[PDB]
Amino acid sequence: AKHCGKHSKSWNGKCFHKKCNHWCMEKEDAKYGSCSHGDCYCYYHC
Known part of the structure; x- marks a missing residue:
């Protein structure tokens, strides 16, 4: 399984x-x- 995870440098207040x-x-x-x-x-999907 290929899970292309973005580097979370996108700040958001509360995570849901x-x-x-x-x-x-x-x-x-x-x-x-x-x-x-x-x-x-x-x-994403590479």
């Missing part, structure tokens, strides 16, 4: 999986967004 997903998708065409370390990680 659903909102992370939405943001990442809208922001840089991320497949999904996941909350890791309380940070919004955008996942």
